[PDB]
């Protein structure tokens, strides 16, 4: 049996990046799907540390928090920079990704209709820091930090992919981010995963908005 | 070695300052005033247009939790092994989640949202009491047997919530004793009593 288990709703959401990471690294894992019906029964929810999913099992280590899972896999799979300075830069990118993800999450679930045009208005200014980071690392031709992929690459890639669905062509203003999405998405195992039914047939979010 | 660049408030620098002080580190405070932020020069120079900004030698970092993790990594406050490191992250991400709710209350909805916030507070604090309960009966730190950057961040979270809702730890004996215990560590005690902590407001809008 695989040593990893992902416990989540039937959505991409906050597990998309860690699943991309696991698939691209050739690691096996198990998906435990929680219907909202099961969630409303209340017992699993009360058993979660912070009352929420994802829940992740690595053997008998039980983790909550999507970014905790990403950092854990980053540590154990060697996707956390080459040294301590790179690890801090990886964190700096991931915190920035999370900051924009929460804005996206707030739009999707609490204010899609009245807020979308304001959000897409502000989107170039929120993407530009990642373009800048790329431009300062080997001309943007490798990864977001350093010479090797990190968990922040998978999280950033997901963030960019869902924003292209929200605002098609939003990366036309950002040549390095655009080429970066194409480059990472062409990694053989990741390309196969992104094309696979276990990815394609899940909605991005839980309310049918994207 | 270190420079902290921030507004003259405790805010998202309070925990990393407590860490630095308790660990006997020295640092320089570059205080950015609101008049100075309004110009726009520094702001446009910051990676995400925001403070804090942190300098460690020729390394420049943004994001409060990046700074905490970097100090945890380089000072040995990040658990004894990868398993503990993951638990430290899980605590810190939970602290950040509640801090985000607190910040949203303080800055966007204090007057109308305060009662609902305080009513929901016990269920937001109980996870940290449960975590203490599962680690040596709550007698040491939030993870493992040694202090971590998450301890400083959790301590700050608890301290500002006691100002927001006095008595909010009274039902939680492990959290209560933990706050007293960490707060009595000599260097931290001295920092928490010092003017550079006491005479800063918690937040930038006079609400607390
Ligand atoms: N900070 C958490 C957020 C987790 C979260 O918001 N989970 C949502 C779905 S992605 C959830 O469980 N909602 C159900 C509920 O809160 O009752 C993480 O990064 O994992
Ligand atoms: N995710 C960032 C958020 C930092 C943040 O919210 N900074 C605020 C003050 S606490 C700020 O710089 N506001 C002024 C501005 O955005 O121009 C962190 O954790 O450091
Ligand atoms: C505004 S909550 O209903 C958002 C749920 C999905 N994720 C996260 S964080």
The encoded tokens of residue A101 equal 């993800």
CA distances to A96, A109, A111, B199 from A115, rounded to whole Å, are 21, 11, 5, 39
And the tokens for B125? 């604090």
Beta strands in chain A (DSSP E): 4-8, 30-33, 55-58, 61-64
Report in angstroms the alpha-carbon separations of B96 from A18, A65, B35, B111, B122.
Answer: 20, 11, 28, 22, 17
- Coil, strand, or helix at residue A123? helix
Q: Which long-range contacts (CB under 8 A, 24 or more apart) does B129-137 make?
A: B129/B172, B129/B174, B129/B175, B130/A49, B131/A49, B131/B91, B132/B174, B132/B175, B132/B178, B133/B174, B137/B174
Q: Measuring from atom 10 of ligand 1, which residue has the nearest CA? A: A14
Query: Using the beta-carbon criterion (under 8 Å), do A88 and B63 form an inter-chain contact?
Result: no
Residue located nearest, by CA, to atom 12 of ligand 1: A52
**Resolution of the structure in the document, Å:** 1.7
Please indicate whether, in this complex, the C-beta atoms of A92 and B130 are within 8 angstroms of each other: no
Q: Can you spell out the DSSP letters for B129-168? A: HHHHHTTGGGTS-SSTTS--HHHHHHHHHHHHHHHHSTTT
By three-state DSSP, how is residue B31 classified?
A: strand
CB-CB neighbours of B166 under 10 Å: 9
Establish whether residue A52 lines the binding site of ligand 1, counting it when its CB lies within 6 angstroms of any ligand atom: yes
Dihedral-angle region of residue A49 (phi above 0 means left; psi in -120 to 50 means alpha; beta otherwise): alpha
Contact status, residue B152 vs residue B199, Cβ threshold 8 Å: no
Best mutation target among B16, B90, B95, B101 (most A Cβ atoms within 10 Å) is B90
Q: Where are the alpha helices (DSSP H) in chain B?
A: 14-22, 34-39, 41-45, 64-75, 82-108, 110-133, 149-164, 173-183, 186-193, 195-198
**A–B interface: beta-carbon pairs under 8 A:** 71
A3, A95, A127: which to substitute to probe chain B, counting the most B Cβ within 10 Å?
Answer: A95
Question: Which residue do the tokens 């406050």 mark?
Answer: B77
Q: Is the CB of residue B157 less than 8 Å from the CB of residue B149? A: no
A13 lines ligand 1 (CB under 6 A): yes
First to last CA, chain A: 34
Cα–Cα distance between A81 and A93 in angstroms, integer?
Answer: 12
Q: With a 6 A CB cut-off, is B63 part of the ligand 2 pocket?
A: yes
Q: Is A29 part of any known ligand binding site?
A: no
Name the closest ligand to CA A205.
3
How many angstroms separate the CA atoms of A149 and A45, rounded? 34
Domain ranges of chain B: 1-77+186-207, 78-185
Q: Which residues does chain B have within 8 Å of residue A68's beta carbon, measured at their own beta carbons?
A: 86, 89-90, 93
Provide the 8-state DSSP code for A48: S
Q: Which two tokens stand for residue B145?
A: 């047997």
Separation CA A187–CA A9 (nearest Å): 27
Cα(A52) to centroid(ligand 1), Å = 4
Structure tokens at B98: 């509640």
Considering only CB atoms, A68 lies closest to which of B66, B86, B123, namely B86
- Token pair 């053997």 is found at A59
| Ligand 3 pocket member A14 (CB < 6 A) | yes
CA dist A141 and A176 (Å) reads 8
Following DSSP, what letter does each residue of B175-192 receive, concatenated?
A: HHHHHHHHHTSHHHHHHH
Q: Is the peptide bond before A148 cis (omega within 30 degrees of 0)?
A: no
Query: Which among B78, B91, B89, B85 has a CA at the least distance from the CA of B178?
Result: B91
Residue B27 labelled as part of a binding site:
no
- Contact (Cβ atoms closer than 8 angstroms) between residue B161 and residue B117: no
């Amino acid at each position: 049996m695989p040593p990893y288990t992902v416990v989540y709703f039937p959505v991409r959401g906050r597990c998309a990046a860690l699943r991309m990471l696991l698939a691209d690294q050739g690691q096996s894992w198990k998906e435990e799907v929680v219907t909202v019906e099961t969630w409303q029964e209340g017992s699993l929810k009360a058993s979660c540390l912070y009352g929420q999913l994802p829940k992740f099992q690595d053997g008998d280590l039980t983790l909550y928090q999507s970014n905790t899972i990403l950092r854990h896999l980053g540590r154990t799979l060697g996707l956390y920079g080459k040294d301590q300075q790179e690890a801090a830069l990886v964190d700096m990118v991931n915190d920035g990704v999370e900051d924009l993800r929460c804005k996206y999450i707030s739009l999707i679930y609490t204010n899609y209709e009245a807020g979308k045009d304001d959000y897409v208005k502000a989107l170039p200014g929120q993407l530009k820091p990642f373009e800048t980071l790329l431009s300062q690392n080997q001309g943007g031709k490798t990864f977001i930090v350093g010479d090797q992929i990190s968990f922040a690459d998978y999280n950033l890639l997901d963030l960019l992919l869902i924003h292209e669905v929200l605002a098609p062509g939003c990366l036309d203003a950002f040549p390095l981010l655009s080429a970066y999405v194409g480059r990472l998405s062409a990694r053989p195992k990741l390309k196969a995963f992104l094309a696979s039914p276990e990815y394609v047939n899940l909605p991005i979010n839980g309310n049918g908005k994207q």
